[PDB]
Amino acid sequence: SHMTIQKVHGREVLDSRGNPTVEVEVTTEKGVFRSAVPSGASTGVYEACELRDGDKKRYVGKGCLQAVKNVNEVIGPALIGRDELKQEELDTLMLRLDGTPNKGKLGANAILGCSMAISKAAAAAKGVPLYRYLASLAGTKELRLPVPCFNVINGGKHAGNALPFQEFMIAPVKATSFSEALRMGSEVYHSLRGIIKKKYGQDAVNVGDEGGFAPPIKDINEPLPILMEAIEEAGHRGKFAICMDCAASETYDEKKQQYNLTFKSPEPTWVTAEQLRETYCKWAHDYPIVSIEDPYDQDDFAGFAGITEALKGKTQIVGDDLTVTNTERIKMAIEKKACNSLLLKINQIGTISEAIASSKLCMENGWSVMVSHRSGETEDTYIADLVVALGSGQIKTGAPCRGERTAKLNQLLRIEEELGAHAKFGFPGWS
Amino acid sequence: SHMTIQKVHGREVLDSRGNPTVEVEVTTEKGVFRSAVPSGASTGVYEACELRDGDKKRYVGKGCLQAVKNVNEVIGPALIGRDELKQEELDTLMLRLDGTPNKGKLGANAILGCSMAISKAAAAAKGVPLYRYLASLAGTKELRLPVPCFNVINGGKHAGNALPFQEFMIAPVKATSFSEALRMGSEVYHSLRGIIKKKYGQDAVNVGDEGGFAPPIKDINEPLPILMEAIEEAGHRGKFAICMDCAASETYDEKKQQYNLTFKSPEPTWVTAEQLRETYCKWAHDYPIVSIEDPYDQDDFAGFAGITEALKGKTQIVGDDLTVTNTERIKMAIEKKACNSLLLKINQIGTISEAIASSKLCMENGWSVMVSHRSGETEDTYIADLVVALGSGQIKTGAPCRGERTAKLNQLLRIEEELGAHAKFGFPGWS
Ligand SMILES: [Zn+2]
Ligand SMILES: [Zn+2]
Ligand SMILES: [Zn+2]
Ligand SMILES: [Zn+2]
């Protein structure tokens, strides 16, 4: 009877780039449950509304005071006295309280932290860790520790360099435990620093938004041999796969219908999609490239489809800006066989219930699901419990560097330890 | 009666550079209390022992399995059934269990996380937040939110550049609240990115270990005008002071008795201490330089003393590698008037009780105390509660960038909010 939501409180906190974001605390008799909202830099146009203040006098327009106010004065008062166990009911209340398709009234950033923190309070009421609670909500038959995909050379909007494509990842697919995966990842990362420093010098080993090295590289092919060399030097030959996120929307010009591979440089380098596919097929034959995210513009369903079929069985194609963790956009991707993997970003959609529905839809149609961070992260570790709960076997959450990335990896170590040596690890299709 | 320590468990986790460190959980009836140990790169020779495995097959010798084992098999079993409220008694037990001056048997890294987590479990038993509990332990008369000293241009061992000196900091000394201080810090940080990128180009805006920019700067004077320009452009002229950490030990050659200002470069640049003092006095007259940490080698008590007196009243001189948070080394610094400020690093000494004794000794003799992170940090936020509890008014915990830095700043926002608008902010001598 006294087992309901007692208090809801939002505040403005800083993310890992130093920009304001929203954090929410749900207080019950079982404690104070705290969830912070991440923020993207390379954001799809179809993402749910991230609500900013636009006051040029605070954080040059990036304050989240309005979203915080919406938590404190609108959403909070509606949740007091409510049964936190009713995830779908409460998520649906919050959708209706908003009343708009994109969460543009209240903000996906106001709503999401409430959604998240409600589920923490509920897990606690059930007497189970978050990952167990969410796996019941998602109807997951089998927990697993995922293979981490470590963005170790950073480009695009996440890094100070000419490099046009955003993410060059290494994934220890042949590890047999999360423990071993994390150590192998870290070990290759440390070898990679020496390789980059020798090749490009001292000034090349500083880090991007996601903890990856940001070398002075322009050419999109150039990182790949450096990744293989790092893998080998660490003692891990044969044990790794490569994952790519091109984030190609960031380079696309809609009026020219072409991709600028030097958009962060003075002169432009225009490239057709048919010249992009030549490059991708060449990646996939040359390297253990098991995943390619956003190989095309977020509305190029045809390019997406073409490359999903030409690489079927070798290389999964991941919708991120394409799908934006949204069942409507997913349904279009399914219909056109545009891709075969979902990048799941809770803040692309804005409720836990919706993000879970997105995962179930995609896995029912045979896709994989890679739970993801945003490039602007916090100390929050929700996505660690979330990927385990969904049983998907794939997470990208950064290089093994920078606390807003390592916090997630460490939370995965804790979950691992709780589940014991019988706990499943990895993505079966890559193992 | 059932109010004792129930379980103690250590594990290996990753720090913000991706290196292993120790984390400890103390379980009581009131919950699971978790504390992780930080790690330095520019470590004084007088620091308590950080115990590593030296197995070149795991993390090229950097594993903390032995320290974790010492927690799990030696320290843990001794704490079960003990009253967590007895901080000094338990800290002293752990010192005796070690039995060596430097904590070289068990490891300062094994001991410290136990110390920390015991105090969290105790705060919980007392029914008060950590900062309140620690302020009672320290006998603090007045809580305060500190002015943060944001290391925004990174050099030395924390960055990929020629820059020999380690830390160039900005401190919003004229803010009237922690909220405003953090926002001003972030705002100047964002202006600074544009200034560096325009001057040095795109490749210059990637970040060092502590979230500061790592531009291609060699000259130790060159960051200072760039800091002033950033302060001004953000709208904050007159509101900031500069804090320096030279970490000069890292450049010192004992055999030559000189400082190499190009030790990360092919050719050496040898400089006398009398040429270093010329530079410091010039800094202090030219800029609002309110703090200079480790201006000399960790054993140059004479250089330290000379510059403490020549800059008395303008610029505090901070012992870090000099003092290593150790009452023995502090007593020598007091005797020679070597410095007038302590950089307090809990893991330089290895118990909470000792770190507190160090703070009280220094403040009783009239010094300031700047609570500090290490360059290898975690998601742990202990030092946020610690600086508030000690009432010292000064913290350095990184640029407002990278989650292992922003986690501390955000925890300071939470404490601020708990204490209300009557809560004291800042270092009175700088306000
Ligand atoms: Zn993106
Ligand atoms: Zn993406
Ligand atoms: Zn140091
Ligand atoms: Zn220092």
Q: Which ligand is nearest to the CA of A396?
A: 2
Q: Is A313 exposed, middle or buried (0-12, 13-18, 19+ CB in 10 A)?
A: exposed
Task: Report the length, in residues, of chain A.
Answer: 431
Q: Are B223 and B229 in contact (CB under 8 A)?
A: no
Paired with B150 in beta bridges are B170
| Run of H or E including A333 | helix A327-335
Q: Per DSSP, what are the bridge partners of residue B241?
A: B171
Chain B: residue nearest A417 by CA?
B11
Residue numbers in the known binding site of B are: 29, 41-42, 158, 167, 245, 293-294, 320-321, 345, 372-375, 396
Q: Which of A23, A50, A84, A210 is catalytic?
A: A210
Q: Using the beta-carbon criterion (under 8 Å), do A15 and B404 form an inter-chain contact?
A: no
Q: Chain B residue with minimal CA distance to A416?
A: B11
In sequence order, what are the beta bridge partners of A28?
A31
User: CB B206 to CB A202 under 8 A?
Assistant: no
**Does the distance separating the beta carbons of B16 and A187 come in below 8 Å?**
no
How far, in Å, CA of A392 to CA of A427, rounded? 7
Candidates A203, A236, A378, A413: best to mutate against B (most CBs of B within 10 A) is: A203
Query: Of the candidates B18, B182, B204, which has its C-beta nearest A400's C-beta?
Result: B18
* Cβ–Cβ below 8 Å for B19 and A59: no
Please report the beta strands in B188-314, taking only residues with DSSP state E, as ranges in sequence order: 241-245, 252-253, 258-260, 270-271, 289-293
Which amino acid is located at B318 in the chain?
V
Please answer whether residues B167 and B151 qualify as being in contact, where contact means their C-beta atoms are separated by less than 8 angstroms.
yes
Extract the annotated binding site of A: 29, 41-42, 158, 167, 245, 293-294, 320-321, 345, 372-375, 396
> How far away, in angstroms, is B43 Cα from ligand 4 center?
8
The amino acid present at B48, given as its one-letter code, is A
CB contact under 8 A, A187 and B407: no
Alpha carbon of A29: minimum distance to chain B alpha carbons (Å): 13
A408 → chain B, closest CA residue: B379
H/E element holding B191? helix B178-200
Note whether B187 contacts A59, CB cutoff 8 Å.
Answer: yes
Q: Indicate the Cα dihedral angle A269, A271, A277, A282, nearest 10°.
A: -40
Q: A200 and A222 in contact (C-beta within 8 Å)?
A: no
* Cα–Cα distance list, B172 to A190, B180, B184, B195, B237 (Å): 35, 9, 7, 19, 10
Alpha carbon B228 to chain centroid, angstroms: 24
Q: Which two tokens mark B186?
A: 């972030």
Count Cα neighbours of A265 within 13 Å in the Cβ-side half-sphere: 17
DSSP-derived letter for residue B376 is B
Q: Which helix (H) or strand (E) holds B115?
A: helix B108-126
Distance CA B373, CA B400 (A): 13
- At a CB cut-off of 8 Å and minimum separation 6, what does B357 contact? B327
Yes or no, beta carbons of A410 and B58 under 8 Å apart: no
Whole-angstrom distance, CA of residue A190 vs CA of residue A213: 11
Tokens of B179: 């909220």
Buried b / exposed e across B243-280, counting CB within 10 Å, b at 16+?
A: bbbbbbbbbbeeeeebbbbbbbeeeebebebeebbebb
Q: Whole-angstrom Cα distance, residue B140 to residue B145?
A: 13
Q: How open is the CA angle A410-A244-A376, to the nearest 5 degrees?
A: 50
CA dihedral for B27, B28, B29, B30, sign (positive or negative): negative
Q: How far is B60 from chain A (nearest CA, A)?
A: 8
The tokens describing A45, both together, are 């146009």
Close Cβ partners of A126 (under 8 Å, ≥ 6 residues apart): A85, A132, A133, A136
| A335–chain B nearest CA distance, Å | 40
Task: Among B11, B57, B206, select the one facing A207 at the smallest CB separation.
Answer: B206
Backbone angles phi, psi at A375, to 5 degrees: -75, -25
- What is the maximum alpha-carbon separation in chain A? 67
Q: What's the CA gap between B3 and A111, in Å, rounded?
A: 39
Contacts of B347 (CB under 8 A, 6+ apart): B37, B38, B39, B40, B47, B48, B50, B108, B109, B112, B374
Residues with Cβ within 8 Å of residue A201, at least 6 apart in sequence: none
- Neighbouring C-beta atoms of residue A218, cutoff 10 Å: 15
Annotated catalytic, A141? no
Show Cβ contacts of residue B382 under 8 Å, excluding neighbours closer than 6 positions: B35, B116, B130, B346
Burial class for B100, CB neighbours closer than 10 Å (0-12, 13-18, 19+): exposed
Residues near ion ligand 4 (Cβ under 5 Å): B 245, 320
Residues 6+ apart with CB under 8 A from A34: A23, A24, A25, A117, A120
Per DSSP bridges, beta strands B7-14 and B20-28 are antiparallel
Q: How many whole angstroms from B247 Cα to the centroid of ligand 3?
A: 6
Tell me the chain A residues in contact with residue B11 when contact means C-beta distances shorter than 8 Å.
413-414, 417
Closest chain B C-alpha to A264 CA, distance in angstroms: 8
Domains in chain B with CATH codes: 4-127 (3.30.390.10), 128-429 (3.20.20.120)
Assess contact for B223 and B168: CB atoms under 8 A.
yes
Structure tokens at A324: 């934006």
What residues are paired with A145 via a beta bridge?
A425
Tell me the count of A-B CB pairs closer than 8 A: 154
Question: Do the strands B31-36 and B144-145 form a parallel or antiparallel pair, or are they unpaired?
Answer: unpaired
